[PDB]
Amino acid sequence: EEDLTEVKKDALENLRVYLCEKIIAERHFDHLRAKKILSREDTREISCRTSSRKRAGKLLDYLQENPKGLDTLVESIRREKTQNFLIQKITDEVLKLRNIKLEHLK
């Protein structure tokens, strides 16, 4: 996936918005508390779970400049709720983002 994946930091940003509601760790803590990316307090801002956008919004936010930190989430989303459905949309992003590799290279 590597050639199409170098883009992934850009992908993770558009990913932030489409995943944030149907995602993990706002679910209880569960799918996020599985791997425990960072410390207790990091996960505290996500416990804040008021209005829909902030809930997982700050979660994925704090992981962003941690290359595999947000990957840690999508990796776990793989089988997560029902099936690969979300993962397929993420796969679409990474493969489609390949054009952006050329753009960032220009």
UniProtKB/Swiss-Prot annotation:
Summary of the tissues where the protein is detected: Ubiquitous.
Quaternary organization: Homomultimer; homooligomerized following recruitment by CARD domain-containing proteins that form a nucleating helical template that recruits BCL10 via CARD-CARD interaction. Self-associates by CARD-CARD interaction and interacts with other CARD-proteins such as CARD9, CARD10, CARD11 and CARD14. Forms a complex with CARD14 and MALT1; resulting in the formation of a CBM (CARD14-BCL10-MALT1) complex. Forms a complex with CARD11 and MALT1; resulting in the formation of a CBM (CARD11-BCL10-MALT1) complex.
Protein name: B-cell lymphoma/leukemia 10
CARD domain residues: 4-92
Sequence position, cross-link Glycyl lysine isopeptide (Lys-Gly) (interchain with G-Cter in ubiquitin): 8, 22, 54
Subcellular location field: Cytoplasm, Perinuclear region; Membrane raft
Superkingdom of source: Eukaryota
Effect of residue 38 to A: Abolishes cell death-inducing capability
Modifications made to the protein after synthesis: Phosphorylated. Phosphorylation results in dissociation from TRAF2 and binding to BIRC2/c-IAP2. Phosphorylated by IKBKB/IKKB. Ubiquitinated via both 'Lys-63'-linked and linear ('Met-1'-linked) polyubiquitin chains in response to T-cell receptor (TCR) activation. Ubiquitination is recognized by IKBKG/NEMO, the regulatory subunit of I-kappa-B kinase (IKK), and is required for TCR-induced NF-kappa-B activation. Linear ubiquitination at Lys-8, Lys-22 and Lys-54 is mediated by RNF31/HOIP; linear ubiquitination is recognized with much higher affinity than 'Lys-63'-linked ubiquitin by IKBKG/NEMO. CARD11 is required for linear ubiquitination by HOIP by promoting the targeting of BCL10 to RNF31/HOIP.
Consequence when changing residue 46 to A: Abolishes cell death-inducing capability
First-to-last residue of the parent protein present: 10 to 115 of 233
Effect of mutating residue 69 to R: Abolishes NF-kappa-B activation
Resulting phenotype, residue 43 to I: Found in a mesothelioma sample; uncertain significance
Function: Plays a key role in both adaptive and innate immune signaling by bridging CARD domain-containing proteins to immune activation. Acts by channeling adaptive and innate immune signaling downstream of CARD domain-containing proteins CARD9, CARD11 and CARD14 to activate NF-kappa-B and MAP kinase p38 (MAPK11, MAPK12, MAPK13 and/or MAPK14) pathways which stimulate expression of genes encoding pro-inflammatory cytokines and chemokines.
Effect in UniProt of substituting residue 32 to Q: Abolishes NF-kappa-B activation and homo/heterodimerization
Intrachain disulfide bonds: none
Record: disease: A chromosomal aberration involving BCL10 is recurrent in low-grade mucosa-associated lymphoid tissue (MALT lymphoma). Translocation t(1;14)(p22;q32). Although the BCL10/IgH translocation leaves the coding region of BCL10 intact, frequent BCL10 mutations could be attributed to the Ig somatic hypermutation mechanism resulting in nucleotide transitions. Immunodeficiency 37: A form of primary combined immunodeficiency, a group of disorders characterized by severe recurrent infections, with normal numbers or an absence of T and B lymphocytes, and impaired cellular and humoral immunity. IMD37 is characterized by hypogammaglobulinemia without lymphopenia, but with profoundly reduced memory B cells and memory T cells, and increased numbers of circulating naive lymphocytes. Inheritance is autosomal recessive.
The species this protein was found in: Homo sapiens
Phylogenetic lineage: Eukaryota, Metazoa, Chordata, Craniata, Vertebrata
